[PDB]
Amino acid sequence: TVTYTNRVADARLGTFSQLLLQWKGSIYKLLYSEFLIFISLYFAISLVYRLILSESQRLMFEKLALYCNSYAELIPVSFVLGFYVSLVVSRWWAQYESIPWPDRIMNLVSCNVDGEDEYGRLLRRTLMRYSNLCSVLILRSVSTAVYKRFPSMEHVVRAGLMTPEEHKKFESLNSPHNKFWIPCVWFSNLAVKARNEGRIRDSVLLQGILNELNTLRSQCGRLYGYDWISIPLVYTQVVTVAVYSFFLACLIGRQFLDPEKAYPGHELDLFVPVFTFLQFFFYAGWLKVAEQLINPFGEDDDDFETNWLIDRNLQVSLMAVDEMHQDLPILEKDLYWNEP
Amino acid sequence: TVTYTNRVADARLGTFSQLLLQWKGSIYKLLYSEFLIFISLYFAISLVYRLILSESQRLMFEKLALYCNSYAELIPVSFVLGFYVSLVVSRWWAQYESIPWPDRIMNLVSCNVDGEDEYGRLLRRTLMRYSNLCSVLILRSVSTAVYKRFPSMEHVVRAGLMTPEEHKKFESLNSPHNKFWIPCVWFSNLAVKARNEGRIRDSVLLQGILNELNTLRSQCGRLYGYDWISIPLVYTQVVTVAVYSFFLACLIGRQFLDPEKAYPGHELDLFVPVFTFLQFFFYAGWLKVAEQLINPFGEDDDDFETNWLIDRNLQVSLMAVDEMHQDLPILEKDLYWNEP
Amino acid sequence: TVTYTNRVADARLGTFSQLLLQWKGSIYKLLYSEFLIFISLYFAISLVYRLILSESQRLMFEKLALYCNSYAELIPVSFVLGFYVSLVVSRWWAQYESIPWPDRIMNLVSCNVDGEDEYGRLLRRTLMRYSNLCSVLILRSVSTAVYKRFPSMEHVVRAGLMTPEEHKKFESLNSPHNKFWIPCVWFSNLAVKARNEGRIRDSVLLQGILNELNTLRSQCGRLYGYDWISIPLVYTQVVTVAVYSFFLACLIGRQFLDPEKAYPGHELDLFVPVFTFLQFFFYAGWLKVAEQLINPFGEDDDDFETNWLIDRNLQVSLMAVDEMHQDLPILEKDLYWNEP
Amino acid sequence: TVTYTNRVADARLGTFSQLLLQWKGSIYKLLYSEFLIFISLYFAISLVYRLILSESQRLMFEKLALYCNSYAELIPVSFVLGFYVSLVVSRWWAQYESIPWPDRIMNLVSCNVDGEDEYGRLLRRTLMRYSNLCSVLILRSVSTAVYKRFPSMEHVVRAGLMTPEEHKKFESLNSPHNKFWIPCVWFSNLAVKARNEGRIRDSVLLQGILNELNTLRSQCGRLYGYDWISIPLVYTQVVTVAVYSFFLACLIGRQFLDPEKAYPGHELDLFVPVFTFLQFFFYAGWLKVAEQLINPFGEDDDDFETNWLIDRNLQVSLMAVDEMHQDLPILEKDLYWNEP
Amino acid sequence: TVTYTNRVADARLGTFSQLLLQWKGSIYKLLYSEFLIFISLYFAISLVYRLILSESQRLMFEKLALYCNSYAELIPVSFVLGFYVSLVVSRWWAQYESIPWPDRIMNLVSCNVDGEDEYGRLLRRTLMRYSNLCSVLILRSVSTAVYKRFPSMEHVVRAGLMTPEEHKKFESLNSPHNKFWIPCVWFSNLAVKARNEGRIRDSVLLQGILNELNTLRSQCGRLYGYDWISIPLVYTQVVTVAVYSFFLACLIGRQFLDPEKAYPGHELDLFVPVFTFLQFFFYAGWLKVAEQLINPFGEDDDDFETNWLIDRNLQVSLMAVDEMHQDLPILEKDLYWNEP
Ligand SMILES: [Ca+2]
Ligand SMILES: [Ca+2]
Ligand SMILES: [Ca+2]
Ligand SMILES: [Ca+2]
Ligand SMILES: [Ca+2]
Ligand SMILES: [Cl-]
Ligand SMILES: [Cl-]
Ligand SMILES: [Cl-]
Ligand SMILES: [Cl-]
Ligand SMILES: [Cl-]
Structure with a gap:
């Protein structure tokens, strides 16, 4: 995508004429x-x-x-x-709006999956990695840029998006269909396992996390639908x-x-x-x-920056749920505070 | 559907000209x-x-x-x-978006219906089969392809979508209207029965499952509405x-x-x-x-691949809630892990 | 409505030409x-x-x-x-989509309002009858077909949609405005009464039922809005x-x-x-x-079949919450079952 | 609004020709x-x-x-x-759909705020009055008809929409911005106070009521947005x-x-x-x-009947939560009842 | 924005002709x-x-x-x-509708975060400040007016939107991407901390607050998407x-x-x-x-009044959750009250 929004903030003389160059x-x-x-x-x-x-x-x-x-x-x-x-x-704008973001999920995972020890960090990081993995899988199904970045699942493993054990489990599951939905099932089962081990306080918070996971799934399904159901030939x-x-x-x-x-109409010959x-x-x-x-997930100059979004989502999710788990700035009185 | 999205990822010289052949x-x-x-x-x-x-x-x-x-x-x-x-x-795109998918339901059923024994597997498989059966019933009501695949309920039984006992119960219920809604009532009652037997931990998780079931029902109702209410003759x-x-x-x-x-305008005769x-x-x-x-559920080349979707949904749901119930890959430190 | 969707499933030679006859x-x-x-x-x-x-x-x-x-x-x-x-x-399609269906409500009422005795059956049947009564009231406000079917509330009583006691209570409430919202208040109060008597297990299930009731209300309000706010004269x-x-x-x-x-332009006289x-x-x-x-709730050939929908909804709701309350087919192993 | 929907229910000879008169x-x-x-x-x-x-x-x-x-x-x-x-x-239809209705709120307040004594009636009536007051405030901000009906807050007090104590509290709160949001904060705090006094059974029902209140707020915000953000001059x-x-x-x-x-083109002179x-x-x-x-909240013949809606909402809400609190018709067997 | 809605309430002779001046x-x-x-x-x-x-x-x-x-x-x-x-x-109207408002959040924070002491006030004020800070951050990312108001984070600190401790924590978190999402993670973690200290009664109310926070996040993400994904050059x-x-x-x-x-066509020469x-x-x-x-967040006369909205949101949120926390007018009988 070639963004130019900041350059056209104000309507001036020829505010579009520069863009012609x-x-x-x-x-x-x-x-x-x-x-x-x-x-x-x-x-x-x-x-x-x-x-x-x-x-x-x-x-x-x-x-x-x-x-x-x-x-x-x-x-x-x-x-x-x-x-x-x-x-x-x-279809172009609807496809942009269907790209999954991990922010809603990571807000709940960072605050509702307890434990500052190694196991709590492992749980939060693994949940975020599963959600990001679902997004990566559907994106490499629907985007030639992402597919060229990850031509096989071994490339996904080498990029840290999937562990080798998860790759062996992924390949052991036999399905003649697209397997992008596997990490969502893994996420739901891991969240329930965290709940059963006392890491999630109760089932209201667990259900909130599962609802966000299903919202993410629906985004991935919309991507799948726009890829599968092309404009009629x-x-x-x-x-x-x-x-x-x-x-x-x-x-x-x-x-x-x-x-x-x-x-x-042919009175003047201008060549x-x-x-x-x-x-x-x-x-x-x-x-x-x-x-x-028609396919905004390719390698055109104006196509969506899918690889950059993948990088951003991974880094931001891992920082949100690991570095910023129960890590709050000191509570202090703001500038507008008034004493009783 | 004839998908060609991958072939038009990038805008090149004549990227549509190949499609003409x-x-x-x-x-x-x-x-x-x-x-x-x-x-x-x-x-x-x-x-x-x-x-x-x-x-x-x-x-x-x-x-x-x-x-x-x-x-x-x-x-x-x-x-x-x-x-x-x-x-x-x-109406065409709205009808595609109304086709029910079992993924949201199966994520909750796989993780929230407990028991690794025979009864837990039976419960999860039966719930998924009921949801898929509702989808199959409405699809064969609205799609000539699905109806030709399943010309009677005996064909639905022979395909494993419905057991003979369920067929006898289905036929015993007397209604002069379309009976696609029966398996949704069966699903809700079975989910409550699972909850009352201790298989579902509490009523928040039960209500989440019922909400997804009602979302599925609404999809089936939208399919019914587009089939019933055609474009005015x-x-x-x-x-x-x-x-x-x-x-x-x-x-x-x-x-x-x-x-x-x-x-x-008739100066030149070109035949x-x-x-x-x-x-x-x-x-x-x-x-x-x-x-x-106008009816994208027929047997045109560009009509929706409804039979394939039925097959995919059945296989994926049964694998999600049976093979992948509490079946998680080993938790391990990811590539980006940092020690304290 | 004159449905012809099944006749135009496949694009053939003259698939619309038959419809001309x-x-x-x-x-x-x-x-x-x-x-x-x-x-x-x-x-x-x-x-x-x-x-x-x-x-x-x-x-x-x-x-x-x-x-x-x-x-x-x-x-x-x-x-x-x-x-x-x-x-x-x-406006035509939006009005069709605003017609209330009882299926979402009946799925929850059939499974979450307990009791196989006379009182449980009475509670479930009365709740469904209240929801259907709200739909009937708004429909006869907005549809000439339904109004001609039920020209007064006595006709509604004679059709079993409202009991004579409910008619006396309905008339005792004094309001100079349309009273279609009364049965929704009755439904919410009856649901809370069922909850307070132990018939609804807890407040999560009660709140789910009330949410579906409010969704139904919003549908009725959309019908009221399209009837009231006509296309500007x-x-x-x-x-x-x-x-x-x-x-x-x-x-x-x-x-x-x-x-x-x-x-x-007047060179040839063809009469x-x-x-x-x-x-x-x-x-x-x-x-x-x-x-x-412009008013799809009249008696045109292509207008909505509102009386038929009323009949269908009543019969299906009463069967769902009475005949099919905790009435499940025998659980058995499906065709695709695999032993451990 | 000049409604004529009932007159055009059926397509006849000249069904629009009468409307010309x-x-x-x-x-x-x-x-x-x-x-x-x-x-x-x-x-x-x-x-x-x-x-x-x-x-x-x-x-x-x-x-x-x-x-x-x-x-x-x-x-x-x-x-x-x-x-x-x-x-x-x-924008016209979107503005109609943004007008707040109290029905969803009153269904929950009538059934979930307990007490047949004076205090329960006071609580239910005050909650409904707060929600209606928010709607009135935003409407008189956005509608010249409502503003001419209520040219100052004293007119709002004299109409029983606001008590003099509430007017003193309203004026004591200092804000250089539109104060239509005050009664929503009052509603949420009163609902929590009712919950803390035992009048609301638990926090699931309290949260349902607060969700409906926030839905109402969003409607008021949409009204504010359409008033503030006019069509570009x-x-x-x-x-x-x-x-x-x-x-x-x-x-x-x-x-x-x-x-x-x-x-x-000037061959015939017809004057x-x-x-x-x-x-x-x-x-x-x-x-x-x-x-x-462009502004459907004025005093045109076809503008929205905002004052009438205010009257209807007030009367209906107060009747729903006071006269019809736990006031149900006698439960009896319906016409279609079948004995076991 | 140049609002003129009140001037065109009624259709009169030349109701648009004045606007020409x-x-x-x-x-x-x-x-x-x-x-x-x-x-x-x-x-x-x-x-x-x-x-x-x-x-x-x-x-x-x-x-x-x-x-x-x-x-x-x-x-x-x-x-x-x-x-x-x-x-x-x-895109213009969709961008207006994506601007976050704190009203839904502040209604829940004002009533569900308990404590009239210094710590309760600090908690409520800090939560509101975090939500407003997320909105400010995304707005200064997407709006030249807001960016010129706050050219660096030090300007945000000097305006009381962020404390110096929060600025040090914000800068300590290392990310090569836009950091507008940080205060949402801070909000969720602070809300959970308030819940764990007894300030939030239970997890249903906590989850309601987190849901509103995620709704706010989604608004900020829509703003980010419209800024990033401009109309194709x-x-x-x-x-x-x-x-x-x-x-x-x-x-x-x-x-x-x-x-x-x-x-x-050139018979008359009018110069x-x-x-x-x-x-x-x-x-x-x-x-x-x-x-x-094309960019309604600039400094055009008709662009959105983003700085004014920032001021309004800050003042209203702080008043809602501090001055109006459990601060209700005296309950009294309304004008329409009837004795038993
Ligand atoms: Ca492309
Ligand atoms: Ca077709
Ligand atoms: Ca008609
Ligand atoms: Ca007007
Ligand atoms: Ca601009
Ligand atoms: Cl889905
Ligand atoms: Cl439905
Ligand atoms: Cl409503
Ligand atoms: Cl709002
Ligand atoms: Cl988001």
């Missing part, structure tokens, strides 16, 4: 190759019409170009493109066909015809169709943005 | 027959106009074609089609009438008229209306996608 | 009278122009028809109609004025003018304006669908 | 003055053009009118108006400028030009621009509806 | 510089065409202006602008390019051409393009409003 995460970088191909095809066809074709062939080409320019409006580019982009964008095919056919038609219909023939290239910029770019957002 | 779940496969019918009708009418009709009849046909092409724009195809498709798509009729009438008009108005008559066929592709295909998504 | 819940049945009136008015005006008017009067009529056809596009029919229909449709008036004025203009502007005058009648079908039908959906 | 809450009543001003300005300009201007001045006016009519389409009236109206309407200014400039242009561009000059007046009706009326809905 | 938070103030630049460029080009260019150069300029005016409609300004503005507006670049290119084209295509050349300047007002202003709303 940026290359990382820009429309130029996404549209470079398609734009170059389209421009080269247009100018090759222009050179063929201007230098190669004879008089009769130029007349035939002019008729074909008038035909294409008139009937290319039958292609409902904006109709399909707007629907497709709205669907992509809603028919929509993707239709929208790319619409854009591509419209600009293939424009490759002929937007040529600069001979001004001596006095065709309507470069600035407005056609602009229209390509807008529509093709709209499609390319949809192409980048 | 796929046949399963494609627009081509959905639109094949309608496209063939439309093309055949257009070319039959073209041959009648070109070879059969005389001069006066050709003149009458030309007038009719100008009339049809001018006044076919009174048909608000995109107006009705966009609304209908937006409604279909919102009036909308379906209006939208199909709009598409069909528009392209029936196009069968006449988009013919290649005689260029010698110098009709405006094949490429842009009319494209417009059919887009609009008719938009309707066909709506036809495929 | 249905009359119940169809656009034809809703639009019959308006279509007949519009067609009769058009043909009466056509006969006046063709047979009654003289030359000067025909010329004046032709000028008026050109004027009306040109300036009827100033009426933004689709602009207002799309907004009005989107509002109607969102200004919108309804504006949208009907727009449709009616547009087609009143079309009654003149869409007449077949004399082809000898060579008016642009029947097929595309004008189609445009009436689509726009007027869109309005009629809004007219049918 | 209503004056209260109608578009005619909202648009009367603007329509009269627009019509008078149009006819004054028409009289100036027809009777006062000379030949050269008429020619200049005709050129200006052609210019204005052609270039007034550059004003994107529907673009801005549709967005503004959608925002207004979403820039949007309101832009949309009114767009409507006003478009119809100021129409005051010139829609005049009936001299038919002898044979201007295109009254029926379609221009219709277009004013639709667009200006759309803006006026937005003007009425 | 306001300068603070107005479209004029946002669009002043861009409008001046556009107007100056247009009139400079007009003077060049009218006074500097010769006959041939004027003819070339006229051809270029016809070309630009015809082909500037290929730029889909409204298509991209409407999508971008809808996304901005949805590609969209911002595309939309600003579309607006800027369209009006750069209008700088040539909307010039007043020589009326003697009888170009269609000032009133409708072009209006179209700039609407479209450019629409973009500027998006520029102001």
Whole structure:
């Protein structure tokens, strides 16, 4: 993700104009190759019409170009493109909101799993590691970046997210389906074990912890659902066909015809169709943005920073439940305190 | 469902162009027959106009074609089609999100229903089987795929989802309505029975399990509501009438008229209306996608994989609450552990 | 409601074309009278122009028809109609989702209100009857079908939904406002009374039951809000004025003018304006669908089946909490059971 | 609010046509003055053009009118108006849904705050009065109708919503901010006091009551947020400028030009621009509806009936928790009862 | 924020026309510089065409202006602008709703943390200060106004939001990530410490307080997500390019051409393009409003009043949990009381 929120805090003269100079995460970088191909095809066809074709062939080409320019409006580019982009964008934000955070879980684990000894620290750290492991498992199922970071479970073990004993237990459980849900069952059973050993005071606090665990599970299930249930392939095919056919038609219909023939709309020959290239910029770019957002867990510049989030969650959880377990600053009177 | 999320992780040159070559779940496969019918009708009418009709009849046909092409724009195809498709798509995703998953229930059942003996295993397995049975019952009510898998309750018994004793009890209960809610009542009563026998420690954990059961029930009720309350038939009729009438008009108005008559827009005779066929592709295909998504629980290529989900849920639940009941990996110090 | 979900499970050739032959819940049945009136008015005006008017009067009529056809596009029919229909449709589905179901309540009442004796059965049945009575009261407030079924409270008593003692207590409570909330207070007080008599084990289960009761209340309040707060009358008036004025203009502007005058667009006289009648079908039908959906609790073919839902809820609740209280099938090993 | 839901239950011939005859809450009543001003300005300009201007001045006016009519389409009236109206309407319904109701609170207070003596009645009545007082305070902050009913806190005291002792305590608390949140703190502290005196059985029921109180608070906070955070003034200014400039242009561009000059579109002189007046009706009326809905807590005919809701809530709450505390109808066998 | 809700309570003649006279938070103030630049460029080009260019150069300029005016409609300004503005507006309101309020927390802390002595007051005040500190930390991360108020943590200490001991503990915790979550862990641990010392009666009330704390955390996480995940830069670049290119084209295509050349649409020379300047007002202003709303936590006139909210929350929380802890008005009979 290329964040620029702080740069656009205030509406000033040209507060978006500076953002046009940026290359990382820009429309130029996404549209470079398609734009170059389209421009080269247009100018090759222009050179063929201007230098190669004879008089009769130029007349035939002019008729074909008038035909294409008139009937290319039958292609409902904006109709399909707007629907497709709205669907992509809603799914994009919903997918961000489904990424699990350990903060709600760690607040309860840090304060309700008692014991400053080695066993209490082990329990709190293991619970946090199980929750983070569920998140890691589903993320590497749904994200190519995370999967390239952890191409096998041995990589997960070498990163300290899973112990070798947990890896052996994980592999001993036989299931022909995705095993991201295993650490949630491990978490619930460990929490109940902590409760039965006196480390969790009572079943209200245990149930609060289990509720947060199930909330985390539901987040992972939403990630799984957006990965599994992609946008229907028919929509993707239709929208790319619409854009591509419209600009293939424009490759002929937007040529600069001979001004001596006095065709309507072809009175001035400027050689470069600035407005056609602009229209390509807008529509093709709209499609390319949809192409980048359709899976926001890849390695695009604007895709979600999933590996960074994994690192942050691990470090913050382990610090919250180990370093900051019953570790409070000294209670003192604040500035606004008033004596009785 | 034809998932392709991993293939479009990164926005590259033509990241959607490869998807155009796929046949399963494609627009081509959905639109094949309608496209063939439309093309055949257009070319039959073209041959009648070109070879059969005389001069006066050709003149009458030309007038009719100008009339049809001018006044076919009174048909608000995109107006009705966009609304209908937006409604279909919102209902499609909402229906996916209403499919019940047993994970939240199984996390609590695996850890809070005590006993490593035969009776504890029987209790946990039976509770999970009841929840899965409710999901199966509503799914076979709402899904033709699941119904064809389980055409009667005897098929449900033979698949191990229901015991013969449970089938006899199920049939003994007399109700002129859908009986998918029975296993939820069975689940709540069994959970209370487990609590009264000491298998559930206290009523906070019992209430947590019952809350998850009621959440599952609400999912099943949402499935029932989307099945029962279909999109109003009036909308379906209006939208199909709009598409069909528009392209029936196009069968006449988009013919290649005689260029010698110098009709405006009929200067070039290309025999094949490429842009009319494209417009059919887009609009008719938009309707066909709506036809495929209107009931996403059928046997379309892009419909939900309900039988697979049933299998996954059953296997995962039974493993979670039986194999993984109080079965934790050895607690050990993680990689990031620091000594005091 | 006319459900057809099972008929459109799979996308086939013409999967919507069969639905065009249905009359119940169809656009034809809703639009019959308006279509007949519009067609009769058009043909009466056509006969006046063709047979009654003289030359000067025909010329004046032709000028008026050109004027009306040109300036009827100033009426933004689709602009207002799309907004009005989107509002109607969102409110329609939200109103369906607000209809209360007793299943969540009955799951807890069946399992947590103890006693197989007469008093336990009386308690469970009375609690379910109170919840169903709240739903019935709000439904007969908001639904003309339910109100015609129960035109007074005596009809509610004769249907077994309310006892005569409960009717006397209900009438003794003096309130100048809608009394649908009374049975919820009765339910909460009876549940607390059951708890105080030992029939509910503890206050966690009591609070769970009260939470479900309050969830039910909120559903009834949403029904009350959609009934009370109708779509602003200004919108309804504006949208009907727009449709009616547009087609009143079309009654003149869409007449077949004399082809000898060579008016642009009036070259061919077909006597029947097929595309004008189609445009009436689509726009007027869109309005009629809004007219049918604006109150989905009436007696339209596509309105909600509220009386059937009342019957289903009553029968299912009473069976759940009486016949199926602590009445479980024999626990037995399932098909997938494995011995230790 | 002008409710008409019962009148449109069934879709019949002209089910909206009757609503056109209503004056209260109608578009005619909202648009009367603007329509009269627009019509008078149009006819004054028409009289100036027809009777006062000379030949050269008429020619200049005709050129200006052609210019204005052609270039007034550059004003994107529907673009801005549709967005503004959608925002207004979403905020309108969200504001209705944020109005607090005491029913959920009163169900718990009536059944869980024990004691049939004077002190129990005082406790229940005072708790309900505190919750209603919070709602009243926020409503008079956000509603001009409620504020005109209660212009000072003395009016609130004289209406029995607040006792004089509570008014003295309320004024003794010093805060430079809105004090609508005070009675919620009072409610929570009184509920805990009732619990500590044995009037609330245990802390699960106390916590349920506090949860409902916090739900009520959140409703009041949503009301506060919609009042504080109005629709951005820039949007309101832009949309009114767009409507006003478009119809100021129409005051010139829609005049009936001299038919002898044979201007295109000015062939027939009807003196009254029926379609221009219709277009004013639709667009200006759309803006006026937005003007009425932007603050639905005023004194418009279609604004929310806030004073009536206040009265209803007070009476119903006091009856629920005082008259109907442990006051149940006699338990008896229902009509469907079956003996063992 | 410039609130004007009270001024538009009632729909009257010109209820929006007064708002046009306001300068603070107005479209004029946002669009002043861009409008001046556009107007100056247009009139400079007009003077060049009218006074500097010769006959041939004027003819070339006229051809270029016809070309630009015809082909500037290929730029889909409204298509991209409407999508971008809808996304901005949805994110704007969602960001307001994510701002944390301490009221739900303070209601529970004021009533459930016992003790009128110094230690009870210290506990309640410290808990409220921790929750407010979390909100302050995330706000200064996401808001330039709050960050300019508190440029370092020393400023937070000097404002009484954090004690120097808490600052030393805060800095001793080592984390390469944003530390806004620290005070939530501190809050949970302090609440558990209060519970273990007898200040919180039992674990149901403790869990209620922790649930409200986690709700607050989730609000802070939503703020963090909207700050981190900005609107994709590609969209911002595309939309600003579309607006800027369209009006750069209008700088040539909307010039007043020589009326003697009888170009269609250039019959009247008024020197000032009133409708072009209006179209700039609407479209450019629409973009500027998006520029102001894209980060509503800045220092714009219409941005959220975050510093004021911080002040209000601090003062109200400290008063709620200290001055109003077990401090209730005298219980007395209300006006509507009836004796038995
Ligand atoms: Ca991507
Ligand atoms: Ca299907
Ligand atoms: Ca109806
Ligand atoms: Ca108002
Ligand atoms: Ca800003
Ligand atoms: Cl789940
Ligand atoms: Cl339900
Ligand atoms: Cl309610
Ligand atoms: Cl709040
Ligand atoms: Cl969070």
